[PDB]
Amino acid sequence: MISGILASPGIAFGKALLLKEDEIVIDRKKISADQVDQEVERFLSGRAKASAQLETIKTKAGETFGEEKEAIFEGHIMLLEDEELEQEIIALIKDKHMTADAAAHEVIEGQASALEELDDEYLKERAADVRDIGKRLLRNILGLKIIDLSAIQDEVILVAADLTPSETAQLNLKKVLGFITDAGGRTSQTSIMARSLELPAIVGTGSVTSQVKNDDYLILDAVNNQVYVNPTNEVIDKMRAVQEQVASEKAELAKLKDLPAITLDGHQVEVCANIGTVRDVEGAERNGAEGVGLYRTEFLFMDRDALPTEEEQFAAYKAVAEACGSQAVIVRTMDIGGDKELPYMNFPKEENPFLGWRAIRIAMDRREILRDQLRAILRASAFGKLRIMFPMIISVEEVRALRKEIEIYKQELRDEGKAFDESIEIGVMVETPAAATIARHLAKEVDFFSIGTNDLTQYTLAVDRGNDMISHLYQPMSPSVLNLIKQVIDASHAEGKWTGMCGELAGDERATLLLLGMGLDEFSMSAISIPRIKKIIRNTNFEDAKVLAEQALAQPTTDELMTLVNKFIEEKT
Amino acid sequence: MISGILASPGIAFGKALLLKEDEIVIDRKKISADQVDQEVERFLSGRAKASAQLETIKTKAGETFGEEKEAIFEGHIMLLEDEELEQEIIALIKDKHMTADAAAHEVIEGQASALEELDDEYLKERAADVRDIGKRLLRNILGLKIIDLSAIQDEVILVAADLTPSETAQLNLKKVLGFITDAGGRTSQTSIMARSLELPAIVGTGSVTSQVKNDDYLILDAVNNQVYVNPTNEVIDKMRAVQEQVASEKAELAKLKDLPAITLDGHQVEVCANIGTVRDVEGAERNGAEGVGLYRTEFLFMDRDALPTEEEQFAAYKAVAEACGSQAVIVRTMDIGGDKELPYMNFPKEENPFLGWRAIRIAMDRREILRDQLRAILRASAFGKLRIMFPMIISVEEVRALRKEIEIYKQELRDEGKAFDESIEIGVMVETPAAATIARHLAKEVDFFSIGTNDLTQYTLAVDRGNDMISHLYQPMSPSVLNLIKQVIDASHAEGKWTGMCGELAGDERATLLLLGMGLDEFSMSAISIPRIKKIIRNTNFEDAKVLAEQALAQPTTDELMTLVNKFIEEKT
Known part of the structure; x- marks a missing residue:
């Protein structure tokens, strides 16, 4: 007897895909001055990857969905390269001697945190897209295995605790017969896509992913x-x-x-x-x-x-x-x-x-x-x-x-x-x-x-x-x-x-x-x-x-x- | 039995002043190249005088009549110093090897001549004021005795064949009990002044100056x-x-x-x-x-x-x-x-x-x-x-x-x-x-x-x-x-x-x-x-x-x- 909020009505039959991730660990250990120069380079070196990898996702959105989805990545990429972030991320590391993953998190979290203070559901969702950019940045500096939702060769249902705007772009709409997640509700970016895409999907499951294993056959x-x-x-x-x-x-x-x-x-x-x-x-x-x-x-x-x-x-x-x-x-x-x-x-x-x-x-x-x-x-x-x-x-x-x-x-x-x-x-x-x-x-x-x-x-x-x-x-x-x-x-x-x-x-x-x-x-x-x-x-x-x-x-x-x-x-x- | 056009009605009694001048002689004798440099200097030297003498007349108009008459001289002086006249007067002497009094006359006469082509009595009078500036310039280069109408110590009537706008400014209104001239008619600048000044005066006498000697007693x-x-x-x-x-x-x-x-x-x-x-x-x-x-x-x-x-x-x-x-x-x-x-x-x-x-x-x-x-x-x-x-x-x-x-x-x-x-x-x-x-x-x-x-x-x-x-x-x-x-x-x-x-x-x-x-x-x-x-x-x-x-x-x-x-x-x- 499991019930969710149902964002799109319909029916579907297919295998279940499970997105497993490794909890993002953040070190609060202060760094020494000699480590200040090295941490900045690690950030630049880690930022160097996401720069090229983010660009690759953009090209897939343009060919896959079109210019409507291609430009959204440019905004995320352009915002990431904002000269304000470069000076603010480097200043905290140089001034507070903090780590790049801990210092960078505060900068993106700081802005997104300000957006949440807003009393509007429409502005809050955009804050979710901005939050996603910093969330992946931490993985990019650490260098975490990237499952990549584009590597799907067979039709499957998509099950996850929650999806960040970044995943929705590099997502295969034709190979995903639906979307199921335990996020908060319609206030979730991915939830709006189910409505506009007109495909069956749930976002308030609550705990279905903990009951499903990858390759499980499920009927929605x-x-x-x-x-x-x-x-x-x-x-x-x-x-x-x-x-x-x-x-x-x-x-x-x-x-x-x-x-x-x-x-x-x-x-x-x-x-x-x-x-x-x-x-x-x-x-x-x-x-x-x-x-x-x-x-x-x-x-x-x-x-x-x-x-x-x-x-x-x-x-x-x-x-x-x-x-x-x-x-x-x-x-x-x-x-x-x-x-x-x-x-x-x-x-x-x-x-x-x-x-x-x-x-x-x-x-x-x-x-x-x-x-x-x-x-x-x-x-x-x-x-x-x-x-x-x-x-x-x-x-x-x-x-x-x-x-x-x-x-x-x-x-x-x-x-x-x-x-x-x-x-x-x-x-x-x-x-x-x-x-x-x-x-x-x-x-x-x-x-x-x-x-x-x-x-x-x-x-x-x-x-x-x-x-x-x-x-x-x-x-x-x-x-x-x-x-x-x-x-x-x-x-x-x-x-x-x-x-x-x-x-x-x-x-x-x-x-x-x-x-x-x-x-x-x-x-x-x-x-x-x-x-x-x-x-x-x-x-x-x-x-x-x-x-x-x-x-x-x-x-x-x-x-x-x-x-x-x-x-x-x-x-x- | 002498009759004129009568520009202002009234009556007056006083002595008659006669303006005698020496016909302006113009030499059409071509000048040699060695004389080109000398003629320009003569023009500049002669122009140098009128520059200072014209300025003196301006100050008399301001104190005598006011700012209404003071600025008219600035326009005449400013027009005379126009950079177009300097290049045009010098070019003819240098290019046509003409004399300064003959070459300068063509420049001022040339513009005034263009104004006469106009079919308006109002534009024609202004052409009279511009013509007067060049007329005196010829006297200034030659250096002709200047009677100056400001040297009047006794009340007298003003009689002349015709007066140029330049004279009307340096003219003593209080010592002149009237104006009499044989000019063309109301189309004459001085004639308009009699109307506005509201003083008795004739402008079409025809030949009164040839019948009057200076110091003659006349009743108008x-x-x-x-x-x-x-x-x-x-x-x-x-x-x-x-x-x-x-x-x-x-x-x-x-x-x-x-x-x-x-x-x-x-x-x-x-x-x-x-x-x-x-x-x-x-x-x-x-x-x-x-x-x-x-x-x-x-x-x-x-x-x-x-x-x-x-x-x-x-x-x-x-x-x-x-x-x-x-x-x-x-x-x-x-x-x-x-x-x-x-x-x-x-x-x-x-x-x-x-x-x-x-x-x-x-x-x-x-x-x-x-x-x-x-x-x-x-x-x-x-x-x-x-x-x-x-x-x-x-x-x-x-x-x-x-x-x-x-x-x-x-x-x-x-x-x-x-x-x-x-x-x-x-x-x-x-x-x-x-x-x-x-x-x-x-x-x-x-x-x-x-x-x-x-x-x-x-x-x-x-x-x-x-x-x-x-x-x-x-x-x-x-x-x-x-x-x-x-x-x-x-x-x-x-x-x-x-x-x-x-x-x-x-x-x-x-x-x-x-x-x-x-x-x-x-x-x-x-x-x-x-x-x-x-x-x-x-x-x-x-x-x-x-x-x-x-x-x-x-x-x-x-x-x-x-x-x-x-x-x-x-x-x-």
Whole structure:
């Protein structure tokens, strides 16, 4: 009668793998001065190994799982090589004459210990990944046998007292038919993977590993929450039928699913990822993005040491369009020239880059840039739903000149026997107070708007997004920016178009009810913000938010508008 | 029976002064190479004199007339020392082997000749002042006797074929009872002075100087347009009575006057000067300013090599308040930090000064600055009508924090037995799209607004006022900026306050009908623009302008809005 917390429902049959380790012994014996130089070298020599061995694990994650898991190792490796650790680890040994395994443990444990003080389950899990890096470092200095979970040649079930984030990367998902551990619970990194991977697994067994030996045959019910050890065929049978039900359940659920970001009372909005690079599509899918709301094409340009030609752009766009499957990508034409220069362009310096020769102002002074790019986007639209959107729009003049441009580039494509989506929709960033002001006029001329509040805030308040000295004045949650937001949304709706938002406000927990109440159609953010905002959306009543929004829009003061938001959150969920 | 054009009506009795000169002879004899080095030295040696002699005339103008006439000489002297003249004068002598008096004449004549090609009477007169500088230079190289009009010990009438701007400066106004010349007409610089000086004078005599000898006694009717030469007492009498009528005319007119900038149909606005320094009050009075609409106090701060203390500021403000007589000055608190740094502050660099730590953002981070200044303004208000206005306002928060500040500084003054105008009105620059957006809210909190369109344009369009590369996008005459202007004016009026404008649009001939139609209460500009705009205002019908304004505000395009303005100007005056 053994029961755990069951993190993923399902059924499985296979052999049991047991991870046996040698308790990490730490010597608290003080070292002499002559041993100070030797201990540092041992740390560097031991650190020298993990450096190369950690790199080997990274390459396996990229080929095995992809770039989504490959970069996590770079962060762990980059954090390990942090110059702060080198000076802090060496200082304690040199200053306190402590051992490298005891001194190094304090440094990584010290930071992770600070993270645990946090009162958040999400921050605590990351502290688990950081703790794992130091835990293996001690083995690396001592030189402990590395079982390595990658050396699995046969399908088996994975059983362990607890797994550290480092093992999950170099873990064979195809050869592991499930995961069973006695860790704490869902707050365990590996436990979250079972949920997302959708594979049967337990994490609160409590003491199954002490009852299982390697090569043991076990059947996981993950339905009755029971484990059969060397059971006859009468149980191997029941289970097999339990597994049938499980499979039928999928088959039935497989029909319809649910509705996207929808308030309690039925109001739907889109919620999408802003991206920079195909590589960001992974995070977007991971975080439940319903499409891409802003594809900052600059970022692709800073992903290279030369200006990407029509063809390179096309390919890059095609990949994205395809890595997005059915989903729509809003490809913004290039926005170089505020805090985002590309050095390879060698553009001249400006007194105020953010009020300078930025984005569209360049592509219009150098048509080859605008042309290659729009050409490339159009052509890529033959391969997935793309939209075109323009940055730094300031006038109706600009929009007409660029549409006219599109139309020219469209014909050329037609003439060169090159498909493009003839349906392709065109919109504009509203991220200038100009644009916001003439929103009505612009709304006749485009299919949609996305409000860039980073910029809009910047120009409306004349506060440089980069300038920490006045950051306290950078308030996208001003009665001034909100009003301009409303005015834009309304413009959209008056023409029967829609406004999205890719500025950081979309992703800001504190604006979500207002953005919603004000009728924003689409939110686009860092992928990581998608769930927080989705959550807020799913738990609001839309009508209430309207009332909230309206109130907020009448406040002459941020504080006063923050108050409304807060009393709402108090009274309303 | 001699008749001229009569530039100023009046009567006068006195001796006649005759300016006799020796025709300037120019040698067209080519010089040899050995003479090239000698001719340059002669030019430098001759130029060396005029350098010191011109400086002497400047000092007489400052003490005699004031700073208004002292700076005109600096421009003439600064232009003469222009490095372009040194290279061009020397190049022709060295390259064409020409004489210094013949080569130098071509350089000054060449530029003045280009100015005459202009089709404007105002630009042509300035070409007369530049021509005068080169005319005297030829005498300075030759070394011609200088009668000097400053050597007058007895009251006399001034008679000459024509006077060059240079003579008008070193001219004794108190010892000259009038001016008579046979020049071309009002297009003559000296002719304008008779109008502004309000003294009897003729400029189209045609040939009076050839009929008058120095020391001749002449009576100027300037009423019957006749001159009596050595006439009996019967005419010296009639005239004396004519002069009586003239004096009574003044006495009667001396009652009331007229109305300020008023459209044909009775709509009045204020029209004022923006200033930097007491010294600008002169230009303001000169150009018919009805008060000062913006006293950029920064400029006073850049008039010094140290931060001006409370006391220095007070004095500076007091002077202005007093140099303005009955007139109101709108003293703006200090606006340092976009393109206007004061080097002595050694502030650190910013990535976007114009979106940085500017104006009020400083005075609020360093109260001593705000305090000294507001203290000084208040105290100066005990001495003339002053208003306080704040730059770079972005929120209602900012305004309340600063009013609260005023109130504290007010009490301190009360407690130190220091008068200040308890009536003192407080307003804000609306030059941020934030301010423009929350204009309604701000209007409850201040007594007035002045729209800074230089900045407002800048932030609304995100185009740096400094950046020539994108200057073509800097359009204060956008449907976006105009709308925001309207919205501000309306805010004012809704609270029963008023909006003025000190941005350059106020002074822009092309906005005047719109600004007017949109109900702007007050215009403030460079003094030099006051008459052009006054003229436009005085010749419009206000109702028509409203209609114009309204139309313009609906245009989605600048061009389209320029068209309205133009068809107006065509059809309406």
